[PDB]
Amino acid sequence: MTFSSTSNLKELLRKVVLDVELGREQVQLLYKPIYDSIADSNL
Amino acid sequence: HLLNGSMYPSIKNISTVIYYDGWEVTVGKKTYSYKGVTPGKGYLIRPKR
Amino acid sequence: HLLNGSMYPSIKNISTVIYYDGWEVTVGKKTYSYKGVTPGKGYLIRPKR
Amino acid sequence: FKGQPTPSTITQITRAKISDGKSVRVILSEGESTKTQQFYLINGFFGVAMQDGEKGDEVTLQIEQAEYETDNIVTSEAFEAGKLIYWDNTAKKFTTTSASNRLVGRVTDGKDSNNVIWFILLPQQ
Amino acid sequence: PQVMDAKWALQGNCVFLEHIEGEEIKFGTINAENGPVARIQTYATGFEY
Numbered sequence: 001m002t003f004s005s006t007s008n009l010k011e012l013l014r015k016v017v018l019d020v021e022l023g024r025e026q027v028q029l030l031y032k033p034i035y036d037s038i039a040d041s042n043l
Numbered sequence: 044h045l046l047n048g049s050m051y052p053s054i055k056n057i058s059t060v061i062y063y064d065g066w067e068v069t070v071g072k073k074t075y076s077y078k079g080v081t082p083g084k085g086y087l088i089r090p091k092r
Numbered sequence: 093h094l095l096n097g098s099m100y101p102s103i104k105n106i107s108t109v110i111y112y113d114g115w116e117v118t119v120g121k122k123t124y125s126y127k128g129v130t131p132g133k134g135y136l137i138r139p140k141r
Numbered sequence: 142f143k144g145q146p147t148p149s150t151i152t153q154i155t156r157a158k159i160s161d162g163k164s165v166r167v168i169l170s171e172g173e174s175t176k177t178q179q180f181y182l183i184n185g186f187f188g189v190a191m192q193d194g195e196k197g198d199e200v201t202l203q204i205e206q207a208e209y210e211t212d213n214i215v216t217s218e219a220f221e222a223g224k225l226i227y228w229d230n231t232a233k234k235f236t237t238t239s240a241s242n243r244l245v246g247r248v249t250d251g252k253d254s255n256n257v258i259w260f261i262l263l264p265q266q
Numbered sequence: 267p268q269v270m271d272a273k274w275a276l277q278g279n280c281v282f283l284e285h286i287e288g289e290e291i292k293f294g295t296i297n298a299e300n301g302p303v304a305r306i307q308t309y310a311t312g313f314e315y
Contacts, residue, residue: 003268004177004192018270020301021092024277048097071159141146158314 164203182230220252273301
């Protein structure tokens with residue numbers, strides 16, 4: 001009795017996820033040391 | 044060594060090097076060979092990611 | 093010694109060196125000479141295997 | 142052995158038999174494809190392709206020459222027990238017309254209601 | 267398993283385009299990033315003496 005018969009029936013076969021690093025890079029505020037900030041809602 | 048009195052520094056962050064030479068066996072009439080690293084060529088590898 | 097700044101280092105993994113110069117002897121009208129190492133030549137030897 | 146201290150010579154002890162020969166691997170061309178547990182004539186070998194190949198992959202044709210339950214018959218032809226059974230690769234179906242079709246076995250159980258026939262598989266002649 | 271299933275994750279996309287006062291804002295989007303797929307084979311060898 002081949003294992004290939006049970007290949008398609010993924011429900012019967014145990015499922016394990018291939019652990020891997022997924023995501024996207026975190027962006028950062030590079031400018032800040034250069035610029036001097038002035039904050040005022042009325043500009 | 045200081046070629047022409049030019050102190051070259053040691054490379055770092057290379058924790059280890061490995062040497063995978065070829066492997067071979069003539070089982071029966073047919074010859075089966077696991078290719079090794081070619082002479083000269085090399086591979087700088089990031090580990091276990 | 094340092095040569096134009098080229099600090100060549102000593103070569104290691106050489107346990108011992110030998111100078112097998114020849115050995116000559118004259119027997120009568122014939123001279124028999126065990127030729128030594130020819131000048132300007134050298135041989136690296138893996139010991140006793 | 143490389144870098145061994147002394148020369149040596151090796152002698153090969155030949156033996157012809159290399160595998161049981163129950164199962165042969167074949168490589169699938171463009172027009173060929175396989176499903177698990179089904180009969181296929183590939184590269185002149187007939188038998189049960191024990192896996193799914195689609196194309197380009199190498200697949201296991203199992204040729205133990207045992208009794209097999211196969212159906213897939215041309216139901217117009219009546220398969221009596223004991224008849225010689227041929228594979229028509231143009232239709233990819235069993236038959237008993239022979240002609241240019243390949244011979245593949247001999248029928249044990251005749252065509253029942255479900256078009257299910259048990260047949261012994263002949264060698265790869 | 268014979269084949270190990272892939273991971274999945276979701277991300278969004280937006281750009282902050284320059285906004286004229288009369289501009290109609292442009293919406294973002296989402297997308298799915300799926301991991302890779304790994305499978306394990308069988309190797310075997312023997313003798314008959």
